[PDB]
Amino acid sequence: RVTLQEAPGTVPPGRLPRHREVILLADLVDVSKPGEEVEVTGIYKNNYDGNLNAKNGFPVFATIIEANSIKRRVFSWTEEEERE
Amino acid sequence: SAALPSIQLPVDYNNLFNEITDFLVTFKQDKGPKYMAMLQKVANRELNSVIIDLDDILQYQNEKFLQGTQADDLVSAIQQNANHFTELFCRAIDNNMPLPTKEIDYKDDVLDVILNQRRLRNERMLSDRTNEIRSENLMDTPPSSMNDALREVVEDETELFPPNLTRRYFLYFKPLSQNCARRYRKKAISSKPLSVRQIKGDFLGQLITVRGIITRVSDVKPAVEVIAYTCDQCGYEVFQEVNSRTFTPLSECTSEECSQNQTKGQLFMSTRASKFSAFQECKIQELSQQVPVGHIPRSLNIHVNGTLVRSLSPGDIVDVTGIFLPAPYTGFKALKAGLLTETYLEAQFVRQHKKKFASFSLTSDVEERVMELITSGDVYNRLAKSIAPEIYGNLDVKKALLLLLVGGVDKRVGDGMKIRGDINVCLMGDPGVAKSQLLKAICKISPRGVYTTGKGSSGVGLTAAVMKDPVTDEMILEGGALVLADNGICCIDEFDKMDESDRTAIHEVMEQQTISISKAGINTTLNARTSILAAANPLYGRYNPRLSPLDNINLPAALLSRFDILFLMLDIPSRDDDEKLAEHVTYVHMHNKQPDLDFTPVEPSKMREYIAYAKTKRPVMSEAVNDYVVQAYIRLRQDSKREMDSKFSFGQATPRTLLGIIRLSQALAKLRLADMVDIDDVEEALRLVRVSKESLYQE
């Protein structure tokens, strides 16, 4: 589970940045470290909770993003890097 | 069945009930029987509580022994089964209740008219059922036999209000005194006061007396015993008893008319028709001399019900006599072993070690003792010398402490402002002058005395703190030491070591007699009418004549002016006085008492009742004493102006000094039990003021 927050450079002036919960499957785990900007494609679906929300008094649902793919918007050197 | 087997016990409640009924109508203490007159007072709505004294029962049994007849030991049976004998005595009282001589009217209580209506409804139901059965005329047939049988069939056929719902009184068991048990070779466990450590599980169900200090008292709340429901379908009133900390309400009607019918009615609560009790939960703590070596004092719960409420206040040394009863277990379920029960003491009687000054009444017994103390002669000097007979000398110090205990007259002016009548006394001096012993003695003498340490009591321990009461489930403001000593003397030892917050609190209290707290918890003003007695040291710990008296007294001018009397207590080494002090102290150490046998010191209870009688007087001042006080104040101001530049300055003369002179004169007039203030009272007040500082500093 990854919390995705709106980047502060794109937020409107008076408004707060929105956040979502992104669910990462078997091969997508540990690919995005906290504090970095990523771009995630996925299914925007509705999470199910028992007896809905009693605090609101309304049948309010929570939403999640099941990630199909993650693209990021490394100190590895090759032999060409070595000879350079 | 063998699942609930039976045992044979020595107790038989039938002959014990007969003995109770005989005692309530036969016992005459030496108009007619005592408890019959008490029940006549109860039936006339003049008394709300019936106090059964076990001394009366013991006297009754012993008289029955002197006539030779056999009577069971009712006293020990009450001592071991007080919970059952409460209801037994209530039933016996309800059996023979005198008719009310006074007619009910519109000024009586709502409970009284409700019980009267219930009784009239009971008689009307009995009359209607008797009339109906007599009108049926089943056999058409010995008039006494048919009247008796008709009475029994009407009595067991009808549904009447039970006696519990027609009782207007509360019944309490006063424990038998130790003296009356000593007279007649009786050994009573109810008379002996126990500490909270010594009350074990084998004392449950018994009427026992616990001795201790009250630490916390809950607010009086209505605890329901039986709830009244009304049904619109059948008109019956359904009563549900409650004997637990929580209950569930009834929904469907359980009366016979609804139970037989197919359509059940719905019950609605009626708060006025149900039965409540004034309920308080108190915490009693083990006294300091009762705690063993190196142990923490324990606490015990006291349940105060009925008319005994508001008889317990925090900080009171008290003997509470009550029934030790078990309670359902409260705590973690995993830590319980078997049928663990909590304990509480259902209070029946309260005895105060120090009787309050506001509860003083001029009865016949106190009058002869007060008159004897008056006619003994020189009441002022005798009361002064008997405050601390152990402490040699300090006659003027003890005189002003006695005036501190008595206090002046508070003044209320029609514009709303008030002038305090309580005297504030400071005792500053070198170590080894027994000022701490005097403070402890004043705390022991005063009914509401709180002894504090300058650093032992902090800011939160002096003013107030908000705390949650779980029994009433509400946030309440628990007061500090100044609240705990309200309308009493608060003694602050080591006054010079206090921090600035406590100094500020005392600075407001000594003049305003209120504490104004505006914090994040509460914005309130609370009444603290303490008369303040402080003890203090100089700058360096010792007095030096090189510096001015103002220099070595660490005390600001305002809080100096708030003290009506400040006593310098200097330890000047002199050969003649050290002989007397040494022989006095060594005699006290040897014969364990006061050396002087030329006069008998007044007992602290005797002093307490005399001071209580003196506080009732409100002396006034005439024109001549007013002129004398005015001229004395003018001379004092001129002398302070002249001595302000010199090294002999003790401060500046103040209108608070005028008020202190007036207050001391009024206290001295109170000590004479007089409604007038004379010249010599003012001369004694001025003499006390002068010998407070100038006489001893000049020498």
């Binding site: - | 705390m467 080591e494 330890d571 364990n592």
Partner: protein
């Protein structure tokens, strides 16, 4: 009836027949109870029905039965209790509660700690030593409930049992509270005829002296019954002997379904409060008749004050008057409580100030080791809350409750304060009340209490210049408030003055002390340390059985006997002496280290009373007053 149960009953009956000490201990308990009952009938205390049993004697008698009790107590302890009950009932025929058992002696591999307790020791009789941390409320547990039926006028009853009373488990049959009888009549509960047995549970964790210094400690729960409740307070060092039992089902039921596991707790049979160094348990020891005779023989000697004082710390040269002051403080004096509630001090406070390396901290450690209830405290380590008391919150009741500080826990004892000069001002103001008024007054939020703090205080201070200066006035050297100096009964200034002969004597004494070997030890073998735990009941090396100087264990017997037995009273022959000395000292012209107040007369009285307690004399004599005056005159000049 079980055959092995009867065989074990007969075997323990034979064991009780062999050892008559348990039999006449039972007889002594029974005659004491009967005498108290007869005294209550004609004109009090009752002894519990349990017997201390030595496991070593049982091992000597029957090794199989001893190993049966140690390994499987559930099958062996109830037959032994049954046999004891039968023997007690056999001796009770001429003059009802069943008798219990208590175990003492060596346990071997079963002498464990709360850390060492594992589940291989479950269902076994174990002895566990530790420190009490939590002590729950003593709650009555209902055993038999008695009810009254008013329609028939008959008294019924019901018995209730649980798993914590019996060692061997039985079928749990929950009998509800009977509120109606068989025919349906109303039953009213008869309190006072019902039976309630006191129940407590305590939490014992391992002592911090042998706990590991890094990680968290381990604790166990101990269940105590009617005769074992209120035998402990939190902070006590205890040895609990009991059966390490497991209760209930560890979630294996369908209703239970968690991994608390099987709950484990000790069914305590025996609680021993042990005395450790600087703890709240007072060191008490059995006084035999030979020891009392020896104490009485030393009481008749005329040099006894010079024998007990010089035999305190023979490894420290000099400071003889300091030894005398320490002895008189250990005697404790006599306090006075008058009819008006006033309290007069009995305890003696000693302050020593002077140069470093003058055997001050060693004397403090000696008094910590040799006093019954001495508690050690340092200057800056302890604070106002740690010294007097503090307030915490109870988890169960939810209300505030008290923690007794160092000075309250040393009630009727000695407070050994080291580095007295570095204490804070709030500490000084707090201890001003304790040294004289002998109490601690607590006025906090919601709590206003007074705790008894009757203590003797030894303080060791240091001059502000590091070394004491002779030509300087002592007020600048001590640099302490006058009130604090007035609180202390005796003040001793120790100076490390250099002299060749004296330094030779010090060096010879130190080297002779450094040439010491313990008995039974080789030349090269290092001396082993065993932590000193003692049960609380109720330069010459060869000082053994009062030869020249009193040995330390017999000196503690002498001190204990003089504290409990003799309470001397003043007489006019001593009174004239103390009055003359006090009134002279108030009017002397020579400068004194300690200022003279009215407290000095009481110090004279306390020192005379303590010296009378040394002599085992019912009265205070003239020589006692002379010794009291001459000891104070050295401390003053």
């Amino acid at each position: 009836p079980d055959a092995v149960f009867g065989d074990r009953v007969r075997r323990f009956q034979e064991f009780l027949d062999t050892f008559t000490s348990y039999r006449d201990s039972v007889r002594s308990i029974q005659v004491y109870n009967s005498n108290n009952a007869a005294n209550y009938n004609d004109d009090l205390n009752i002894l519990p029905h349990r017997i201390i049993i030595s496991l070593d004697d049982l091992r000597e008698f029957d090794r199989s039965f001893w190993s049966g009790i140690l390994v499987e107590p559930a099958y062996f302890i109830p037959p032994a209790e049954k046999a004891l009950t039968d023997l007690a009932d056999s001796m009770d025929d001429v003059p009802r509660h069943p008798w219990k058992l208590s175990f003492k002696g060596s346990f071997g591999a079963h002498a464990l700690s709360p850390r060492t307790l594992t589940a291989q020791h479950l269902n076994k009789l174990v002895s566990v030593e530790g420190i009490v941390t939590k002590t729950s409320l003593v709650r009555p547990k209902l055993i038999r409930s008695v009810h009254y039926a008013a329609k028939t006028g008959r008294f019924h009853y019901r018995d209730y049992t649980d798993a914590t009373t019996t060692l061997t488990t039985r079928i749990p049959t929950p009998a509800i509270y009977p509120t109606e009888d068989t025919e349906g009549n109303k039953l009213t509960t008869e309190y006072g005829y019902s039976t309630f047995i006191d129940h407590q549970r305590i939490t014992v964790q391992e002592m911090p002296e042998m706990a590991p210094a890094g990680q968290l400690p381990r604790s166990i729960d101990v269940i105590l019954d009617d005769d074992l409740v209120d035998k402990t307070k939190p902070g006590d060092r205890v040895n609990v002997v009991g059966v390490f039992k497991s209760l209930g089902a560890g979630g294996m039921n369908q209703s239970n379904s968690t991994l608390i596991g099987f709950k484990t707790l000790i069914l305590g049979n025996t609680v021993y409060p042990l005395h450790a160094r600087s703890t709240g348990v007072a060191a008490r020891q059995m006084l035999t008749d030979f020891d009392i005779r020896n104490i009485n023989k030393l009481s008749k000697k005329k040099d006894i004050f010079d024998i007990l004082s010089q035999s305190l710390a023979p490894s420290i040269y000099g400071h003889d008057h300091i030894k005398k002051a320490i002895l008189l403080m250990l005697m404790g004096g006599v306090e006075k409580n008058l009819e008006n509630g006033s309290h007069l001090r009995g305890d003696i406070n000693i302050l020593m100030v002077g140069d470093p390396s003058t055997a001050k901290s060693q004397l403090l450690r000696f008094v910590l080791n040799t006093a019954s209830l001495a508690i050690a405290t340092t200057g800056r380590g302890s604070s106002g809350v740690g010294l007097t008391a503090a307030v915490t919150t109870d988890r169960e009741t939810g209300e505030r409750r008290l923690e007794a500080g160092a000075m309250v826990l040393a009630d009727r004892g000695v407070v050994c304060i080291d580095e007295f000069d570095k204490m804070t001002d709030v500490d000084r103001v707090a201890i001003h009340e304790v040294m004289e008024q002998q109490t601690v007054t607590i006025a906090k939020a919601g709590i206003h209490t007074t705790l008894n703090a009757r203590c003797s205080v030894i303080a060791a201070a240091n001059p502000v210049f590091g070394q004491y200066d002779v030509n300087r006035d002592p007020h600048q050297n001590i640099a302490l408030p006058d009130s604090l100096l007035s609180r202390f009964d005796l003040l001793f200034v120790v100076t490390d003055d250099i002299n060749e002969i004296r330094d030779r004597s010090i060096s010879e004494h130190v080297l002779r002390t450094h040439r010491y070997l313990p008995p039974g030890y080789l030349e090269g073998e290092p001396v082993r340390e065993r932590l000193n735990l003692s049960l609380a009941v109720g330069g010459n090396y060869n000082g053994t059985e009062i030869p020249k100087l009193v040995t330390i264990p017999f000196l503690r017997k002498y001190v204990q006997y003089a504290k409990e037995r003799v309470i001397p009273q003043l007489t006019q022959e001593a009174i004239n002496v103390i009055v003359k000395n006090y009134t002279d000292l108030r009017n002397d012209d020579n400068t004194k280290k300690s200022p003279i107040t009215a407290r000095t007369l009481e110090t004279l009285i306390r020192l005379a009373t303590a010296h009378a307690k040394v002599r085992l004399s019912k009265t205070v004599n003239k020589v006692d007053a002379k010794v009291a005056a001459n000891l104070l005159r050295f401390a003053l000049l």
